[PDB]
């Protein structure tokens, strides 16, 4: 921690909101197909302050439409997905 | 690009004077505003035999007016400038009216020149599957199967999930197609799971093809499994008639009526296996099975049976029955024998040792003529 | 009036049906149906039928 | 019987959504739903649900919509797909998180 | 290269193919017991009635 010695410092900040939805939708690709376009719902709502979280709301959307055995990511599977994710954290960091 | 089964169908009964003269003329009613409408005197030519000019010159018109628009319309879109992609929706939108009036020929050329260009990825395999489409409308069973395999060589590599779905369904039907119904019966049900419809047959279709091919294949418990106890099957009720007559031969058979059997198989041969094309062709093939298969349980359960007993139990003659039951005694599906004299139907179904042996010595043969044939000529060589 | 007693109902039937059934089978080969459709109680016809279900 | 129910429901559900405004007419609509049932007209009552789902979806933060979502598997119990009997018990029980609901509602 | 002139001689002595002359001079067994059974059943259903 003496200047030039360590020859860079980097910080990375904590993601914007177009950051987030970069993530968010190449993992859905790999998933299925969220139908009426609801990648947007998730980044409007909230900002993550890291890709975890948004990983985070990957897994469960696929959680539900799983247990369905309908492929299909409707809106109603994300809408679970985020408040469940979003509870959590918040349970976490009070 | 939708209609175009929807004529064919009903001209398949027009076709048709297996149907009653009532029921050809409901046929006939239909069908004859939407040819004068959709404009499809190619197709029609073939049928109108096999059952005005002026739908002609509206083909004409028509294929001028929506052949001028188009044709235009592209040229207009070569000039502002989107040289991939303005070009190829433009290209698209001219097979779309060859694809309405039964033309595949012409639809064909125009899908080829989209396809050159190069667009979305997932906007070529919906173009592929519109093609292997068209060999459902000609029910040509030739057409449908090259198709199919230049659509699941780009549905990998597009890695498309969406579009993944449907092929699903076009592949039951090539399958249902033709007799094998071991692929078939398997594909058709988990599309009742997962329908994706964009520019598609109706879901009814699915409901009646999964309750068939489940028939046929499908052991005792697992028809139950999955047929009876389709959740989608049962919710959608018995509504549609087609659907209707083959469910109450599934509930008898599994509840194990014997009296009503045999007058459903009537009713479902009537209602269900004739009006569908495709199945039209397999109506002897699935009848000669079920046949077999009430015997075969009933067989399983007795070692001797009276022929008073097993012919009045379904509801015919013993004279029937016994002729019906030489019919299907040298196929060796039942294993059992009349005795004319006793009046017993006596059963042998051997599972013994030597009837596992049989099974692995047929094997063995055809191990030993390749082993010659690689061998022989190699050897000369 | 109880369509949700009526289903357990027939399912009562076939499982006490079993438990008097392995009984029966265990000291008999060859045994008449007349004499297995006393035990249970129930009609010889019915007995019949049910069987080839099992 | 029949009669009088099917009419009755049918004349008062017009009169209170060209008057009355569109709180009122969501509320008729359950009723309506509840009282097809009744009659066994089970298509009707989940053709009822399907108007409703989406846009009240949007205001389902209510007991009375929670209900729907309670009625809705019931719908389904008798049609005998008990896949989307158990889905619909679960969509009740998200709106139902809070357990602070009427007595009534608790028991169902 | 090698079998051919063996395949040409064996071939004379057959002379010509059968195959083209043949167009010239001109349920695999089984048959759809569907129509059988619809005329049975009527039969039966008499008697019956009159049982």
Known sequence: LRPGRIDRKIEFPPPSVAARAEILRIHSRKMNLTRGINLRKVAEKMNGCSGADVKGVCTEAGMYALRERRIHVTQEDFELAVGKVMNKNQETAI | ??????????????????????????????????????????????????????????????????????????????????????????????????????????????????????????????????????????????????????????????????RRNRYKTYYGIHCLAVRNFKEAAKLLVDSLATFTSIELTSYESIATYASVTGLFTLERTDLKSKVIDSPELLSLISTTAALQSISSLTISLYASDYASYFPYLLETYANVLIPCKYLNRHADFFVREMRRKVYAQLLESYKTLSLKSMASAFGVSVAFLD?????????????????????????????????????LVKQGDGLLTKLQKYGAAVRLT | GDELTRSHFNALYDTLLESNLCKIIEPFECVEISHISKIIGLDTQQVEGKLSQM | SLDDQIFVCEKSIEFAKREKRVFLKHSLSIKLATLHYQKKQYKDSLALINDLLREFKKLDDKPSLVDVHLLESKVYHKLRNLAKSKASLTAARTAANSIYCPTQTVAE | TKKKNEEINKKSLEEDDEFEDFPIDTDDVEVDDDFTNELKAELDRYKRENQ
């Open chain 2, 1 to 162: 690009r939708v209609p175009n089964y929807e004529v064919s169908e009903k001209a398949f009964l027009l076709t048709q004077s297996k149907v009653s003269i009532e029921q050809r003329k409901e046929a006939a009613e239909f069908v004859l505003a939407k040819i004068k409408e959709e404009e499809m005197a190619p197709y029609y030519k073939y049928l109108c035999e096999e059952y005005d000019q002026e739908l002609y010159n509206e083909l004409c018109k028509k294929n001028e007016s929506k052949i001028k628009e188009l044709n235009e319309k592209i040229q207009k879109l070569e000039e502002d400038d989107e040289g991939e992609l303005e070009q190829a929706q433009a290209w698209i939108n001219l097979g779309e009216y060859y694809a309405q009036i039964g033309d595949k020929d012409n639809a064909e050329k125009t899908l080829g020149k989209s396809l050159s260009k190069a667009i979305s990825t997932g906007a070529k395999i919906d173009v592929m599957l519109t093609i292997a489409r068209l060999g459902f409308f000609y029910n040509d069973q030739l057409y449908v199967k090259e198709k199919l395999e230049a659509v699941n060589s780009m549905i990998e590599k597009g890695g498309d999930w969406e």
């Open chain 2, 323 to 359: 002729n019906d039951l030489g019919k299907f005694i040298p196929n060796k599906q039942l294993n059992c024998v009349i005795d004319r004299v006793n009046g017993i139907v006596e059963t042998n179904r051997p599972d013994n040792k030597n009837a596992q042996y049989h099974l």
